[model samples]
Target chain A: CPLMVKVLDAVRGSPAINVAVHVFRKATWEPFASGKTSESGELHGLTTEEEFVEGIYKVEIDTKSYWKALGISPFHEHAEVVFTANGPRRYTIAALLSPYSYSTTAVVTN
Target chain B: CPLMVKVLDAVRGSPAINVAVHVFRKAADDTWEPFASGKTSESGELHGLTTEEEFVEGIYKVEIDTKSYWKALGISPFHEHAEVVFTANDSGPRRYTIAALLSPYSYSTTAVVTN
Candidate 1:
């Protein structure tokens, strides 16, 4: 299944445009897709060349830069979404966030 | 104008099975509508999705659920949420087809308005 992590303002309830996102598979500590939010506070589509091998994944977002840029406060500068995929469906886990606080949720999108 | 995004398997290069996609507007980035959501057995579209959106001409984004699609096949998603963004502009095909090629780590999309 597929997954997604969205970064938004806790108060304004808007997307945190251009926020940096990181994707990490188990064992390895380094991230693969550590890019910024493209559209809809995410990179939306199923296309590529990475040779997707089945395993656990950790999605982390670096919000400090975003918060720093906005000059705000969100005690937790780092937010993570951990999930496992082993099926024939798509999946999206949403992260509703702000400069001061953040949260996550699951959806039946895939 | 409306749009569509396709999910394909990376290795052999074909349409990936059981795809879950979320379509949302750039204007209202907060909420998303399931563009084509379903289990391994059912679906609301073809290889690629068509906007035919009840909405209108504007900037929209489609997010593909990478984990589940690759998981069933037994693999890790180099990508978290495979995202696709496009515009349903005023000067349009007014209709187009989106080819969202799905790879394990990355993805690419192409568009073709009907002739």
Candidate 2:
């Protein structure tokens, strides 16, 4: 099975800047599932815990309209990353953003 | 003129989750400004109002620490997207979240509230 989660600022409110998620197997980079963050900043799919397998995966965060929406001056044209993911159980993708920049992480457990 | 700013998470004690910014000429995109937000759960880079000018530009929000820091990443994977826009005056970009999922779009010349 596959899973996906969205990270939000929480304090600000639900804006029009969401992120997409893709899951893959650690050993072979085999994609397991794909999910998108909801308006409330949450993880979708994978109704059961068993669906999450064990291994390292890659996580990428995409912010489409972080600045333009705020009318604030622009900065980086685009942001992208390739991170390593290891898991044995549960995880969460929490994000706190504004108009300019954002931070994210993929935590895993056993 | 060119400018750059950074946005961060405030409640979570200013974690590593920070976003980068890029400004460009509305019609040119030939490159105008570049800045990065701070880690105060607030926006950084620009000091005074004069720095933020007027014009329609593309905004891209990037989250790197929203997850992983808490030991959660396997549950899912990566995400990405692209959109459109228009501009006139001061605007703010705000975001809210839950445990199950999250949603975000674009807003101009205004702020947002969540439920």
Best by DockQ: 2
- The TM-score of candidate 1's chain A against the true chain A comes to 0.77
Any runs in candidate 1 off by more than 4 Å, and if so which? A45-50, B1-115
Each model: TM-score of chain B?
0.69, 0.27
Q: What shift in Å separates residue B44 of candidate 1 from its native position after superposition?
A: 43
Best by lDDT: 1
**Cα misplacement distance, residue A54 of candidate 2 (Å):** 3.8
Tens-digit lDDT track for model 2 on A7-85? 6653366633445655555564666665656676675663355655444544444444454555555433423333333
Error of 1 at B81 (Å): 20
lDDT of residue B89 for candidate 1: 59
* Residues A36-96, model 1: lDDT tens digits: 7875776444223243456666677776677777877533436655555454555565666
lDDT for position A1 in model 1: 23
B66 Cα displacement, candidate 1 (Å): 23
**Deviation of model 2 at A21, angstroms:** 3.0
The Cα RMSD of model 1 versus the native structure comes to 14.3
Model 2 Cα lDDT, one tens digit per residue, B1-115: 2322233333343422323222223334633343232231333222221233342334423232323323342333233211112232324532311111211211111122232
Highest TM-score scorer: 1
